[PDB]
Design a protein around this ligand. Structure first.
Ligand SMILES: *[C@@H]1O[C@H](CO)[C@@H](O[C@@H]2O[C@H](CO)[C@@H](O)[C@H](O)[C@H]2NC(C)=O)[C@H](O)[C@H]1NC(C)=O
Ligand SMILES: *[C@@H]1O[C@H](CO)[C@@H](O[C@@H]2O[C@H](CO)[C@@H](O)[C@H](O)[C@H]2NC(C)=O)[C@H](O)[C@H]1NC(C)=O
Ligand SMILES: *[C@@H]1O[C@H](CO)[C@@H](O[C@@H]2O[C@H](CO)[C@@H](O)[C@H](O)[C@H]2NC(C)=O)[C@H](O)[C@H]1NC(C)=O
Ligand SMILES: *[C@@H]1O[C@H](CO)[C@@H](O[C@@H]2O[C@H](CO)[C@@H](O)[C@H](O)[C@H]2NC(C)=O)[C@H](O)[C@H]1NC(C)=O
Ligand SMILES: *[C@@H]1O[C@H](CO)[C@@H](O[C@@H]2O[C@H](CO)[C@@H](O)[C@H](O)[C@H]2NC(C)=O)[C@H](O)[C@H]1NC(C)=O
Ligand SMILES: *[C@@H]1O[C@H](CO)[C@@H](O)[C@H](O)[C@H]1NC(C)=O
Ligand SMILES: *[C@@H]1O[C@H](CO)[C@@H](O)[C@H](O)[C@H]1NC(C)=O
Ligand SMILES: *[C@@H]1O[C@H](CO)[C@@H](O)[C@H](O)[C@H]1NC(C)=O
Ligand SMILES: *[C@@H]1O[C@H](CO)[C@@H](O)[C@H](O)[C@H]1NC(C)=O
Ligand SMILES: *[C@@H]1O[C@H](CO)[C@@H](O)[C@H](O)[C@H]1NC(C)=O
Ligand SMILES: *[C@@H]1O[C@H](CO)[C@@H](O)[C@H](O)[C@H]1NC(C)=O
Lengths: 227, 220, 49, 115, 49
């Protein structure tokens, strides 16, 4: 299915562009960080206009109007208020920085495990079975394009945990046993591809008197026609 | 079967900074305004916390797009899940074990508490869906569509996944189902009698209660 | 709202309606979709005792 | 907390007058200038009225049909703008879908897509 | 701290409950098979099999 797969991939990329170019909210996670920082700074600056109990928010106006014995009192009020503002700002920046750091750590983890490798961690690299990922840069962040395999169409098959041949219990080495109503096949779990049940597909362990739900069929032996 | 308990959220408190500092006082409020945005950003900061509390809950529980439900015939190859599945007779359709968990873990000063977006009932529906999915379709519902599979076969995969050939499961299916069922009963016996079993969640509640009690006492 | 030439070109009456209250709270003439806390309801006394 | 009336020696509790936060629920002003107002943690007494656990919601129509949550209110209630006017409803957690479980049936994918 | 815990809980839900973990002692001691979530006040409880 290489041609189909390549076509689906190429189409999916085109879809990413159509979404990103038209949906502003698509990058809300990075814009929000910018907005929070802008607010923190705007808040810090606006605080300079506060009096904090002083006769004026403007330091030069205190100094130009009062002699030191009185000016110092008014200034102390501004200093205390403005220091409280810086302490508040910094504390918020430190906490916010911790959040960003945690995000960066996650992003780095994904780069190493999802982009440089292949993830076996479910929903770590998007919903579906992860194949590969590609990084893209963004303002103050990283964007990952996760390429995943997702089952699309399905059918109802009859199944069994094992098959009886001559009384021996045969189990799949890989895949499951299925039935289309008349014939039993063995096939891989994630993509229907029925195969004839043979001794090279199954293995024997124990017998028919033990396995619950074991069914009767035949197991083909590729050697007998050769002898 | 082991039990792991993790906090997901904390009480969505909200404090009216104006009412807290200058409760119904015009003269005080006029002085409070000289502190500029301090009052305003304190309200903003707490709001931000309250918002992420719902985000946290959704990230943990709302991982499934569909609400799955188990069949009327609970045939899972000998595995008894009746103590983890929702009980239809209850006013809140929670499982027996969930009720045990809920029964162990426990004003006018401008200090209020906001409700969660997802009520206990909503969470119960999400855990029900995740559980029904896990039981009837294994992991396929996590990747895409929920694809039915016999429970015993699902376990066969779970065994191959740990390096144990699946024939072991089938040959010992009755034993395994019995050990499983027993282990669940043990969980109930522990949870119903050991209060400390849920200490991780109770501690969160206690810390929040102390923070609020401290805040109120400071008014004196 | 002061434009680039210092002319007041628009205004919000913060006590006109709940949308105006949101606009004043957010210091903007545009309000994004969502829920915003803007004020506090208080029952007033009707007489003194 | 309480006082003894100075003329008649009876005890009266003092319960501070009802109060609560006020939140405005709105679609963006790019679409509509209609709003709904939520009075948080109050009864629909002192304040097209819908009483919810989160407070008294005024201006939003109560709709029996559930939908995906848009603007969250709390306690299972979300609001949106639809046919337009502001509505409130119990949020859906997703479509209900039973699994065709049986002890002898397996669903196997026959096709896939790359997303 | 709660957010970090919630992130871990969400991680476990996705990798331990929705899938099968290959991460040692991530889903309890022993070889992980499956897990089942249960709700709790302000949290989640996982039964790890
Ligand atoms: C699997 O699904 C894909 C589509 O996702 C099928 O490919 C399409 O087939 C139709 C004809 O029926 C064409 O018109 C489309 O252009 C094809 N799409 C692409 C991307 O090539 C594919 O045939 C299906 N395979 C099976 C076995 O059902
Ligand atoms: C189950 O699969 C088998 C194998 O494909 C089907 O049997 C074949 O059917 C075709 C006609 O479509 C015949 O030309 C072949 O000769 C048959 N092969 C054998 C070994 O009989 C069978 O019909 C399918 N059963 C159902 C219910 O779909
Ligand atoms: C699978 O085939 C075997 C025969 O190869 C069936 O065995 C019979 O079981 C019944 C019930 O115990 C006995 O009375 C018969 O004498 C057995 N037959 C023989 C030849 O020994 C077995 O029941 C079949 N199983 C299924 C599910 O069809
Ligand atoms: C699953 O286990 C429960 C026990 O937790 C079983 O319920 C008991 O069944 C017996 C026999 O009918 C009653 O006497 C008990 O009173 C029941 N206890 C409870 C708490 O309901 C249940 O039958 C088992 N189900 C399966 C399929 O094995
Ligand atoms: C593996 O250990 C289990 C117990 O964990 C054994 O099953 C028990 O066997 C005794 C008899 O010796 C019974 O009285 C118990 O009721 C059984 N327990 C259960 C849950 O069924 C099992 O036989 C051992 N298997 C091997 C090969 O040693
Ligand atoms: C399997 O059978 C059930 C019961 O008839 C049906 O509801 C379901 O849609 C079928 N699934 C598939 C993939 O055909
Ligand atoms: C499967 O379920 C049916 C219906 O209850 C029952 O008759 C049959 O014996 C069961 N088979 C197995 C292997 O459990
Ligand atoms: C400012 O005045 C100039 C004319 O000198 C005019 O062209 C410009 O548009 C005015 N700016 C605004 C914001 O009205
Ligand atoms: C927002 O308003 C602009 C007009 O200024 C319009 O072009 C745009 O489509 C509107 N967007 C939405 C989501 O209504
Ligand atoms: C509002 O008051 C009525 C009594 O008049 C009471 O029955 C109702 O439960 C109250 N609702 C709330 C939310 O308090
Ligand atoms: C919902 O439907 C019931 C009838 O079952 C009706 O009595 C009730 O008023 C309806 N509520 C709304 C908000 O439409």
């Amino acid at each position: 299915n290489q041609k189909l797969i390549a076509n689906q991939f190429n189409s999916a990329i085109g879809k990413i562009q159509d979404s990103l170019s038209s949906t502003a909210s698509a990058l809300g996670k990075l814009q929000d960080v910018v907005n929070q920082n802008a607010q923190a700074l705007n808040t810090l600056v606006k605080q300079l206009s506060s009096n904090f109990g002083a006769i004026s928010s403007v330091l030069n106006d205190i100094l130009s109007r009062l002699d030191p014995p009185e000016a110092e009192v008014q200034i102390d009020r501004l200093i205390t208020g403005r220091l409280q503002s810086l302490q508040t700002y910094v504390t918020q920046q430190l906490i916010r920085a911790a959040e960003i750091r945690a995000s960066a750590n996650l992003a780095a983890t994904k780069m190493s495990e999802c982009v440089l490798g292949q993830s076996k961690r479910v929903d770590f690299c998007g919903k579906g079975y992860h194949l590969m990922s590609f990084p893209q840069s963004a303002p103050h962040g990283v964007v990952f394009l996760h390429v995943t395999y997702v089952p699309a169409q399905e059918k109802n098959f009859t199944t069994a945990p094992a098959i009886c041949h001559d009384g021996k219990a045969h189990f799949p080495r890989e895949g499951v046993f299925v039935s289309n109503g008349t014939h039993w096949f063995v096939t891989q779990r994630n993509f229907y591809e029925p195969q004839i049940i043979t001794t090279d597909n199954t293995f024997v362990s124990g017998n028919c008197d033990v396995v619950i739900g074991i069914v009767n069929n035949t197991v083909y032996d590729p050697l007998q026609p050769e002898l | 079967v082991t039990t792991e308990i993790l906090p997901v959220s904390m009480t969505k408190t909200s404090v009216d900074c104006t009412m807290y500092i200058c409760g119904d006082s015009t003269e005080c409020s006029n002085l409070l305004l000289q502190y500029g945005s301090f009052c305003t950003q304190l309200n903003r900061a707490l709001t931000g916390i309250a918002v992420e509390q719902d985000k946290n809950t959704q990230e943990v529980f709302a991982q499934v797009k569909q609400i799955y439900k188990t069949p009327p015939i609970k045939d899972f190859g000998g595995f008894n899940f009746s103590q983890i599945l929702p009980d239809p007779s209850k006013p809140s359709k929670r499982s027996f074990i969930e009720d045990l968990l809920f029964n162990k873990v426990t004003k006018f000063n401008g200090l209020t508490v906001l409700p969660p977006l997802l009520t206990d009932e909503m969470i119960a529906q999400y855990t029900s869906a995740l559980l029904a999915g896990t039981i009837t379709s294994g992991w396929t519902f996590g990747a895409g569509a929920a694809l039915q599979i016999p429970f015993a076969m699902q376990m066969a995969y779970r065994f191959n996944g740990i390096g144990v050939t699946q024939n072991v499961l089938y040959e010992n299916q009755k034993l395994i189902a019995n050990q499983f069922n027993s282990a669940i009963g043990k969980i109930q016996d522990s949870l119903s009698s050991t209060a400390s079993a849920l200490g991780k969640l109770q501690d969160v509640v206690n810390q929040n209660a102390q923070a609020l009690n401290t805040l109120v006492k400071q008014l004196s | 709202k002061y434009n680039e030439n210092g002319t007041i070109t628009d205004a919000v009456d913060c006590a006109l309606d709940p949308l105006s209250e949101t606009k004043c709270t957010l210091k903007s003439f545009t309000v994004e979709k969502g829920i915003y806390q803007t004020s506090n309801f208080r029952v007033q006394p009707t007489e003194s005792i | 907390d309480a006082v003894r009336d100075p003329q008649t020696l009876e005890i009266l509790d003092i319960t501070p007058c009802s109060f609560g936060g006020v939140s405005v629920i709105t679609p963006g002003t790019n679409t509509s200038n209609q709003v709904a107002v939520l009075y948080q943690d109050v009864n629909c007494t002192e304040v097209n009225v819908f009483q919810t656990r989160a407070g008294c919601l005024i201006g939003a129509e109560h709709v029996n049909n559930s939908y995906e949550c848009d603007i969250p209110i709390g306690a299972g209630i979300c609001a949106s703008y639809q046919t337009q006017s502001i509505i409130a409803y119990t949020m859906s957690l997703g479509a209900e879908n039973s699994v065709a479980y049986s002890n002898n049936s397996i669903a196997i994918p026959t096709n896939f897509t790359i997303s």
